[PDB]
Structure formats: C-alpha cells, structure tokens
C-alpha cells in the first residue's frame, strides 16, 4: 500500500534523479513528460501527491495546475522549478499549488516535504 507519486517532468536528468530517490524509499512513481497527459492521469487516477515542473514543452506547468483544480482534483500538488524567484512560488500558490521547490534539492528535503504535504 506504498505511496503513489505522479511525476510530471521533462528534463530527463531531473526525472531520473527524482525516480531514483523516491524509489529508494519504496514509493511508486509514474512519470510523464507532457503536461496534457499529466492533466489526464491526474484527472483519472488517485495519487498521494503530484510532482509538477513549471518548465514543460506542450504547455505551462501553471496550466497543468489550473486545469487540474478547475476539474476539481484535490490531489496535493508540489511544484518544482529550476528557475528561482519569490514571484513564481506566490503565483503557484495563487493557482492552487500546495508547495514549491527549486532545483537542485537533496533527497532529504524532497522526502520531508512529501510527508509534510500528504500527512502520512
């Protein structure tokens, strides 16, 4: 009954990084590299958390977010950015994100925020 994570990420070095880190703690990770598939998987299956990059090819990370919440997905969404800035976090919070992180990060930080957000 392990923790299920939807990873919506395109930069494949980050995705492999996050996959390795999460899977080393027995998380299940289902990753996609297109936002429009992210919107579909998030609308249709159940996850403990969605890790979402702002930097996506077929649309903005924010559109993924805004569409998921407009479709009334209650799944908690952690946003990842390679692009620091206070303004990005706040816009994320405005669109319905639970939390925000900048790359790079350590394994300890990602895991700690996931538990904090999900509450298990």
């Amino acid at each position: 009954g392990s923790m299920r994570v939807l990873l919506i990420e395109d930069d494949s070095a980050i995705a492999q990084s996050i996959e390795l880190m999460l899977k080393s703690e027995s998380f299940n990770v289902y990753t996609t590299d297109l936002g429009e598939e992210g919107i579909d998987l998030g609308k249709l299956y159940d996850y403990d958390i969605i890790l979402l990059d702002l930097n996506l090819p077929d649309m903005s990370g924010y559109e993924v977010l805004r569409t998921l919440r407009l479709s009334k997905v209650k799944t908690p969404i952690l946003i990842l950015s390679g692009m620091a800035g206070i303004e990005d976090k706040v816009r994320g919070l405005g669109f319905g994100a639970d939390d925000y992180m900048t790359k790079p990060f350590h394994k300890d930080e990602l895991i700690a925020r996931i538990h904090a957000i999900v509450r298990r």
């Binding site: 395109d10 930069d11 494949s12 070095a13 980050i14 492999q16 990084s17 390795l20 880190m21 899977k23 080393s24 297109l34 930097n55 090819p57 077929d58 390679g82 692009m83 790359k103 790079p104 990060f105 350590h106 394994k107």
Partner: protein, 208 residues
Amino acid sequence: SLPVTLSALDLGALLCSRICHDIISPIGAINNGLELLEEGGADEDAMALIKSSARNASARLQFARIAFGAAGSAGVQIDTGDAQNVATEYFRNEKPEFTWEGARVLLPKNKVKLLLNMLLIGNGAIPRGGSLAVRLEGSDTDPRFVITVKGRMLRVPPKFLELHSGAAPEEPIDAHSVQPYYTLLLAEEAGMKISIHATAEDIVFSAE
C-alpha cells in the same frame, strides 16, 4: 524588427538565469546520485546517472561557451566544424535525431552564435522528438543556414513566433523567452533575416 528592447541589465540577468538553469539540472542530478551512494541499494543505477549527467553538464557548458559566451570583434572568427562538434555533443542527450551537412567555413562570431541559437529554437519546435537537420549553404561571405525539423508534434515555439512577427508579448521576457529574443537580437546584429516556412511534413527555419 524587435517589438521590445531589453536593457543591458535585463538581457544580462536573463541570459545568466538561463545558463544557470540549464547547467544546474545535470549538476544537481550528479549530487543526488552521489547522495544515493553514501546510502546503498541503487549503486549501479546511481552511477549511471552520475556518468550521463557529467557528460551532459560538460556538453551544455561547451555549447554555452560559444552560443552565449563568445565575444570579441567580428574578426574573432569561428569554425563551423567547431560549431558542429559542440552541437552534436549537446544533442546526444536531447530528443531529436541530429544531423549536420555543409562544408567547414570560418564565419564572424555573431553568425555562429546565431546558428547555435537557432538549433535551440529548432529543438523547441519538436518537443516530443523527431529530427533536426542542419544545412549550411552559400559561401563564407554570405552563408544561408537551414534548420529543418520533423516530428509527431511540430510547431514554432510560440514566444519565438510572437517576437519574430513584431507583436509585443503579453507576458514579460523571462529566462525562457530570453533565448528566442536573443536569437532575433543576434540575427539583427549579424545582418541576417530569419525566415519561417511550414509544410505538411516539416518546418524550415532559415537565415541569410
């Protein structure tokens, strides 16, 4: 002609933001991989991540040295064979199949900075993959650059089309849209026009 003009403070800050972003990704992945080895369990998987990320950090650094960092008079010339080398190595870990055709020439630095920057536009044109073909035509004194993209998803990257067309963007320039902007700014400084033509099978970015 360009619908917005960025101050030196803004162009400089955005360009650096962009380089840091693109090189931080593999560097961060490397540290993550190293952290996984000070634990245990994923040692062969971690090492593979460290190795490819290192190779990629290096490829991105080399590409950025010329595409963003090169400097000096138009007399500081650059060999397109050197462009082809950093480009080919950059694109190993990118999605499209990358090919290069054309005879080695020496061009003014701004022309080769343009060329490498158009490859980034090209790479954005086919986000789900495909092929990116470079063709160098003309002579060293008036070359033509032809970047031909094919793939299942195929577009002009929207900010690039917007800026190219003279329309002043609704959104302000950021470390993402700075690279299309920079591309257009290089082309003005180099005395070349970019053209964008679409057919059923491909998009062609050209400059001459």
